């Protein structure tokens, strides 16, 4: 049975959330592959199927619980179980399709959405960009209930897509970027719910390119600059791994060392 990490929004603190994200990172990768001080997720080539996934069980005040499945090679949310039903994003290719049949094998009902979990499509379905979907403990609390009641018929599709956007950012992206974990910590500490600003969005949009630039860097320098936005949306370019070491927590395997 795949490793399970638990988190509850009920009585959640900055510390309980940080403990959660750190536990997720610890199950995504051994951390034995470190490039320029930044740990790398396992290479998909050579990774046996019984180590492909981790499970994140989320609970809230209503004692509703859902279990997200994360692919350890990229930390992304592949699908989730609620009760006797599992739901999966549409796979890109038949290899991803085969992998997810190893998830929630005893579940009674398995549903595959027609759409993938990419941000553009989710924002279309939710009817809102990430810039207009508030994040925080409250939103996560409401996302958990929405995911749960999808299986009973009480969650409509736009609400479901919004809830994925919230879960993916507060779990997957926070796992990938300690900056994003810091952004979620700040919201918890100031009892705030608020959408991500461009500094969060451009990081989320650039994880793969940042991981490539770092792993292919020489003497700390990128082959070509990567452009990000500040909080005010103004653009700036990163040329050096040193700027990103306090920002990125995990990289996808892009190259060998």
């Amino acid at each position, epitope marked *: 049975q795949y490793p399970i990490i638990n988190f509850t929004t009920a009585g959640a603190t900055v510390q309980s959330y940080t403990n959660f994200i750190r536990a997720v990172r610890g199950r995504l990768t051994t951390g034995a592959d470190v490039r320029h001080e930044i740990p790398v997720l396992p290479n998909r080539v050579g990774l046996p199927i019984n180590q492909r996934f981790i499970l994140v069980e989320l609970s809230n005040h209503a004692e509703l619980s859902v279990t997200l499945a994360l692919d350890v090679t990229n930390a*992304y949310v592949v699908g989730y179980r609620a009760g006797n039903s599992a739901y999966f994003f549409h796979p890109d290719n038949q290899e991803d399709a085969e992998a997810i049949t190893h998830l929630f094998t005893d579940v009674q009902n398995r549903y595959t959405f027609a759409f993938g*979990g990419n941000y*553009d499509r989710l*924002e*279309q379905l939710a009817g809102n960009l990430r810039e207009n979907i508030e994040l925080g403990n409250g939103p996560l609390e409401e996302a958990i209930s929405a995911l749960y009641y999808y299986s009973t018929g009480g969650t409509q599709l736009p609400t479901l897509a919004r809830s994925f956007i919230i879960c993916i950012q507060m779990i997957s992206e926070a796992a990938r970027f300690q900056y994003i974990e810091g952004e979620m910590r700040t919201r918890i500490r100031y009892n705030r719910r608020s959408a991500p600003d461009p500094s969060v969005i451009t990081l989320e949009n650039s994880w793969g390119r940042l991981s490539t630039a770092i792993q292919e860097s020489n003497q700390g320098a990128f082959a*070509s600059p990567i452009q990000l936005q500040r909080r005010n949306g103004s653009k700036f*370019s990163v040329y050096d791994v040193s700027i990103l070491i306090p920002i990125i927590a995990l990289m996808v395997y892009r190259c060998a060392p």
Partner: nanobody, 116 residues
């Protein structure tokens, strides 16, 4: 899998319209956009998500207008009030991926734009 149209040489104040259509494995297609590089760095001109988010370089705000036809997986760039500083080779750019936003990246062949 990217077919670009457009490009040319204009005088200051002239206008060009670029287009680039994507075909193939673009189930999880995300943001399409345009980069430019002049001789001697490559810079983002504009991109647009399928959901309506637009990024644009300050240099071209109010002059260039990017738009997208999601059914055709095609992005257009209406370049009006062109200036000599807009001279460069322009590339369309296509991001895609279910697992993360920029998992897949495809570059166009580049078309020359010159203003003088």
């Amino acid at each position: 899998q990217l077919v670009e149209t457009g490009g040319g040489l204009v005088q200051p104040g002239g206008s060009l319209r670029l287009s680039c259509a994507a075909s193939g494995s673009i189930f999880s297609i995300n943001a399409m956009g345009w980069y430019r590089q002049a001789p001697g760095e490559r810079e983002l001109v504009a991109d647009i998500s399928s959901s309506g988010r637009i990024n644009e370089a300050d240099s071209v705000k109010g002059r260039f207008t990017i738009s997208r036809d999601n059914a055709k997986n095609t992005v257009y760039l209406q370049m009006n009030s062109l200036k000599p500083e807009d001279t460069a080779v322009y590339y369309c750019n296509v991001l895609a991926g279910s697992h993360y936003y920029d998992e897949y990246e495809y570059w166009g062949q580049g078309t020359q734009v010159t203003v003088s």
